Amino acid sequence: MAAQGEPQVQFKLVLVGDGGTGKTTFVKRHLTGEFEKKYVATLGVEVHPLVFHTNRGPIKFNVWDTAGQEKFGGLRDGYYIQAQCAIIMFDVTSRVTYKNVPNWHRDLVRVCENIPIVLCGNKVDIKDRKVKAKSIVFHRKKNLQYYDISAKSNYNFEKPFLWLARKLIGDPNLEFVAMPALAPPEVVMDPALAAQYEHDLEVAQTTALPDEDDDL
C-alpha cells in the first residue's frame, strides 16, 4: 500500500449485530455497493463492494451482510473467516441489542483475533434514545471505537469506515477525499440533536461517568 500503482486494496468487513438493528439499511446506503452486490448462496450472505476514495487512493470494503440468519441463531465460521475488520451494530432504541453486543464480539474475536472493530449505535434519528452515551461502556475494555449512526439519514456513514481504513492501512492521516454516492436520506437528522449526541459522547469521553465516554 506504501507505493502507487499497486493492485486494489480490498478488505473483508463483517457486519454483525442483532436482527432489526438496521444492518441491511446501513450497507445499502452506498448505491454502488447495492448495484454491485453479490449473493453467495452457500454462505447466505450478500457481499457489497463499498468503494471509498481516500487521499492515498481507493479502498474497497467488501461488506458481508447477512441474509437474516442472525434472527434464528449464530453465524457460521465461514462467514467470519478471513475478516480484516468488523462493525458490530446495535440499535439505540433497543437495550437488548446493546446487551447482545458482547456475545457478537466474542464470536467474532474467536474466529478473527485482534481485528479492528467499530461498534455503531444506529437509529439515532429516533427521539426516544434508550441506549445513551452515558451507558455505552463496552468499547473501553475491548479497544473498539464507537460511532453514533443513523442509516436512514446517512448520519456518520463515513466515520466507521474511515477509522477502520486508518487502522488497517496504519496511516492516521487518511481522509476520504470524496463522499460516495449515497441513497437520499429517508429522514433528516436534526443538527441540534446531532450536536447534542456528539457533545454527550465527548463529555464523558474524558472519563466522565458516561460509559462511551469512560471508553475513550
From Swiss-Prot:
Its cofactor is Mg(2+). One of its GO terms (molecular function) is GTPase activity. The keyword Metal-binding applies. It comes from the Eukaryota. The modification N6-succinyllysine is found at residue 159. The modification Phosphothreonine is found at residue 24. The modification N-acetylalanine is found at residue 2. There is a cross-link at residue 71 (Glycyl lysine isopeptide (Lys-Gly) (interchain with G-Cter in ubiquitin)). Its EC number is 3.6.5.-. Acetylation by KAT5 at Lys-134 is increased during mitosis, impairs RANGRF binding and enhances RCC1 binding. Acetylation at Lys-37 enhances the association with nuclear export components. Deacetylation of Lys-37 by SIRT7 regulates the nuclear export of NF-kappa-B subunit RELA/p65. There is a cross-link at residues 71, 152 (Glycyl lysine isopeptide (Lys-Gly) (interchain with G-Cter in SUMO2)). SMART domains: RAB, RAN, RAS, RHO. It is found in: Nucleus; Nucleus envelope; Cytoplasm, Cytosol; Cytoplasm. The modification N6-acetyllysine is found at residues 37, 60, 71, 99, 134, 159. InterPro entries: P-loop_NTPase (IPR027417), Ran_GTPase (IPR002041), Small_GTP-bd (IPR005225), Small_GTPase (IPR001806). GTPase involved in nucleocytoplasmic transport, participating both to the import and the export from the nucleus of proteins and RNAs. Switches between a cytoplasmic GDP- and a nuclear GTP-bound state by nucleotide exchange and GTP hydrolysis. Nuclear import receptors such as importin beta bind their substrates only in the absence of GTP-bound RAN and release them upon direct interaction with GTP-bound RAN, while export receptors behave in the opposite way. This is GTP-binding nuclear protein Ran. It comes from Homo sapiens. The gene is RAN.
